[PDB]
Ligand binder design. Structure first.
Ligand SMILES: *[C@@H]1O[C@H](CO)[C@@H](O)[C@H](O)[C@H]1NC(C)=O
Ligand SMILES: *[C@@H]1O[C@H](CO)[C@@H](O)[C@H](O)[C@H]1NC(C)=O
Ligand SMILES: *[C@@H]1O[C@H](CO)[C@@H](O)[C@H](O)[C@H]1NC(C)=O
Lengths: 67, 50
């Protein structure tokens, strides 16, 4: 996954995308997560060496686009 | 409630939520109201007789 924002310390808004092998969780909640950042307020929420994955993230006009 | 103090002009459709007491300049405040330390959150007190 990826986590976005400006300060990321439960003060202002922070994006979160996590793939948990069944769905794609997208949250904008500011709250903290697992203390070690690894895999074992919500105004917007969206639930859906052999491999090379390419992504492009950009942010224009308040819009987050993912290619 | 409405704003009168901010340190920057917001980009279109932006959602930075911050209701702390803001400085009026370079003087630090540390969350203490006073001179050059003003709250942005004001009200208009909507009455039907205005
Ligand atoms: C993945 O996250 C979604 C959203 O909370 C949840 O419904 C689902 O059960 C999760 N799957 C696993 C395997 O943790
Ligand atoms: C979550 O929402 C409550 C209600 O406004 C707020 O008091 C709290 O600070 C929020 N949590 C954050 C911003 O981490
Ligand atoms: C976005 O956040 C940064 C924090 O590093 C800040 O400096 C910048 O002014 C912010 N942009 C705004 C409020 O448009």
């Amino acid at each position: 996954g990826w986590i976005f924002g400006t300060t990321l310390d439960s003060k202002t808004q922070s994006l979160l995308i996590v793939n948990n092998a069944t769905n794609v969780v997208i949250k904008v909640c500011e709250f903290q997560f697992c203390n070690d950042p690894f895999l074992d307020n919500c105004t917007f929420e969206y639930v859906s060496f052999k491999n090379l994955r390419e992504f492009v993230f950009k942010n224009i006009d308040g819009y987050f686009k993912i290619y | 409630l409405y704003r009168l103090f901010r340190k920057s002009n917001l980009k279109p459709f932006e959602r930075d939520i911050s209701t702390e007491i803001y400085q009026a300049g370079n003087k630090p405040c540390n969350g203490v109201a006073g001179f050059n330390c003003y709250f942005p959150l004001r009200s208009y007190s909507f009455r039907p007789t205005y």
